[PDB]
């Protein structure tokens, strides 16, 4: 399956299918929304809010990162 791989401090947190609408609360500091086959950072407690402003991802290799919270979201097949 094609999913959004989430790593926190370099450790794989989980892999979430893009084909299923879901909301992932990543260790209280980030919230990922999977909707219509795309992953987007819906909310974050980081000061810069850069992760929240990155465009939704759906293609293999694409990523969303929250550097202050060491969160990496990546699309893997």
Conformation bin of residue 61: beta by default, left when phi > 0, alpha when psi is -120 to 50 = left
Q: Which of 5, 24, 29, 38 binds a copy of itself (CB under 8 A)?
A: 5
**Smaller CB distance to a copy of itself: residue 34 or 57?**
57
Report the Cα 24 to chain-centroid distance in Å. 8
Q: List residues bridging with 72 in a β-sheet.
A: 7, 65
Binding segment for a copy of itself among 13-21, 29-37, 47-55 (CB under 8 A)?
47-55
User: Is 70 one of the binding residues for a copy of itself (CB under 8 A)?
Assistant: yes
User: Is 30 one of the binding residues for a copy of itself (CB under 8 A)?
Assistant: no
Residue 28 marked as a ligand binder: no
| Residues 35/49/51/26 CA torsion (nearest 10 deg) | -70
Which residues define the annotated binding site for Zn(2+)?
46, 51, 66
């Amino acid at each position: 399956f094609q999913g959004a791989v989430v790593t926190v401090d370099g450790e794989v947190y989980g892999t979430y299918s893009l084909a299923k609408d879901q909301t992932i609360e990543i260790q209280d500091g980030n919230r990922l929304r999977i909707q219509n086959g795309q992953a987007k950072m819906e909310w974050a407690d980081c000061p810069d809010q850069l992760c929240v402003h990155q465009k939704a991802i759906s293609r293999t290799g694409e990523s969303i990162i929250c550097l202050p919270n060491q969160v990496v979201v990546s699309v893997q097949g």
